[PDB]
């Protein structure tokens, strides 16, 4: 087939336009996955007196405590909270009184959000093997536009929970059919590059939020700003042209042939794809024309693998969304500190690309998830009055996080078998929503030590290093085709 795409002008003006207006799209992902740094922010509170000084008791810092109200100029605080306006002038935590008693609130909405993202891994999946990769697409950008715009207008904690659920399913729709749709449309020498870019667009992505949420404080209109832009995805992208690769595999041989001519012409290599008619189609198509997940935990070769992988990506990505969503505490202003963050990925990603070729994969592995670890307890144990230690150890944690999402990656793509290789990709990258889904509900542990979340959050990280030993060594060693070359191994 390969053969057909690129006769089919290769890369050119169809590839380069969808391309980059497939890659748009991820430009929002961080933002929407972050979004609760910035729309659900804690302001300093106070609880308000009956309808300073004195109605106020005073903590060690001698700053007012923010949970108790004297009975008599305690008592639980009845009579709501003068959140300060300092900064975040309104944030879901301010409008609907998520704190105090409630502060797990807060985290137990973004925990809610990505269980949408894994189920839109799982179900949005399955239909973009049934309906198409466009239309799912398609279907991806309405629901993340009407469910973004409710969710800015919610009325309640509930149905805001429920619509940032439904924004995460479909924005987790969008993740994956871009890459898939991204792929199965450009020449496998130029596959892995747009895996890359990708990530680049992702990390992009984050300074974005840190440039938005800056003009646009309050929650509403944040929200709003951020989900509006995909109405305009859902209007231009009743455009795109259907994948090829899935026309032949579902067996509707004569809409490949359609989508082949008008990528021909668009490409302006007309001639050639008019020659391509369904004679020869067929004949360079037959030879194309995956095993079940079941495989994985049956064959003890591949339940090993699979162990690992898994215990890899939740520990990667448990540490990484750990690390993303605590942004106040460092001491310096929040979005200084998103636009740092942004800027980690950068340079991390150029180290991690350049210790994977020189060093080895699995020792990049270790090294990148054992100093994510070193740091991230360095950070719990260092107090809060040093600011820039805490800061430059999160930061480098970030990046070795980072790393540690591609490096992981290409090794779970070169370890599995052909057979399995694209299922093992699923249920890994699978795990890692699994981790975030368990990362914001850890943090609420938080109420029963200040350190403990970052403890755990770094004592995962040093396991899953420890786990990466019994990984064999990838570099220099084609990738595997069955079962008997990982025995060989
Ligand atoms: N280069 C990156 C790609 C994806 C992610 C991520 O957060 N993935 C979770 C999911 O989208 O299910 C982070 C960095």
């Given at each position: 087939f390969n053969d057909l795409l690129q006769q089919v002008?290769?890369?050119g003006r169809f590839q380069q336009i969808q391309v980059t207006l497939v890659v748009?799209?991820?430009?929002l992902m961080a933002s929407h996955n972050t979004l609760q740094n910035f729309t659900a922010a804690i302001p300093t509170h106070h609880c308000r007196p009956p309808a300073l000084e004195v109605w106020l008791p005073r903590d060690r810092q001698g700053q007012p405590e923010s949970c108790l109200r004297f009975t008599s100029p305690t008592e639980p605080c009845t009579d709501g909270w003068i959140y300060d306006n300092s900064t975040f002038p309104s944030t879901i935590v301010t409008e609907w009184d998520l704190?105090?008693?409630?502060?797990?609130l807060r985290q137990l909405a973004q925990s809610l959000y990505m269980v949408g993202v894994l189920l839109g891994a799982m179900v949005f999946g399955y239909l973009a093997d049934r309906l198409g990769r466009r239309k799912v697409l398609i279907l991806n950008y309405l629901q993340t536009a009407v469910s973004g715009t409710c969710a800015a207008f919610a009325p309640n904690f509930p149905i805001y929970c429920a619509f940032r659920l439904l924004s995460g399913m479909a924005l987790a729709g969008i993740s994956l059919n871009c890459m898939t749709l991204n792929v199965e449309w450009m020449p496998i020498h130029t596959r892995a590059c747009v895996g890359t870019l990708i990530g680049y667009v992702y990390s992009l992505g984050q300074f974005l939020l840190a440039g938005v949420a800056y003009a646009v404080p309050h929650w509403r209109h944040l929200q709003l700003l951020v989900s509006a832009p995909f109405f305009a995805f859902f209007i231009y992208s009743w455009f795109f042209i259907e994948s090829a690769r899935w026309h032949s595999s579902s067996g509707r041989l004569d809409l490949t042939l359609r989508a082949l001519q008008r990528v021909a012409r668009i490409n302006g290599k007309r001639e050639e794809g008019a020659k391509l008619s369904m004679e020869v189609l067929r004949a360079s198509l037959q030879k194309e024309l995956q095993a079940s997940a079941m495989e994985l935990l049956r064959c003890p070769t591949l339940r090993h693998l699979f162990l690992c992988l898994s215990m890899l990506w939740f520990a990667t990505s448990f540490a990484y969304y750990g690390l993303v969503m605590d942004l106040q505490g460092f001491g310096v202003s929040i979005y200084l500190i998103q636009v740092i963050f942004g800027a980690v990925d950068l340079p991390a990603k150029l180290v991690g690309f350049l210790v994977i070729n020189s060093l080895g994969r699995r020792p990049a592995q270790m090294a990148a998830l054992l100093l994510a670890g070193i740091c991230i307890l360095l950070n719990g144990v260092i107090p809060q009055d040093q600011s820039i230690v805490r800061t430059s150890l999160a930061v480098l944690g970030k990046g070795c996080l980072a790393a540690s999402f591609n490096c992981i990656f290409l090794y779970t793509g070169e370890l599995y078998?052909?057979?399995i290789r694209q299922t093992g990709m699923g249920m890994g990258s699978t795990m890692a929503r699994v981790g975030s889904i368990v990362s914001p509900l850890v943090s609420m542990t938080a109420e029963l030590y200040p350190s403990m979340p970052l403890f755990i959050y770094g004592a995962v990280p040093v396991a899953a290093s420890a786990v990466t030993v019994l990984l064999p060594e990838t570099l220099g060693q084609p990738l595997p085709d069955t079962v008997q070359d990982l025995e060989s191994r």
């Open positions: 002008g290769g890369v748009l799209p991820l430009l704190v105090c008693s409630h502060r797990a078998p052909t057979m």
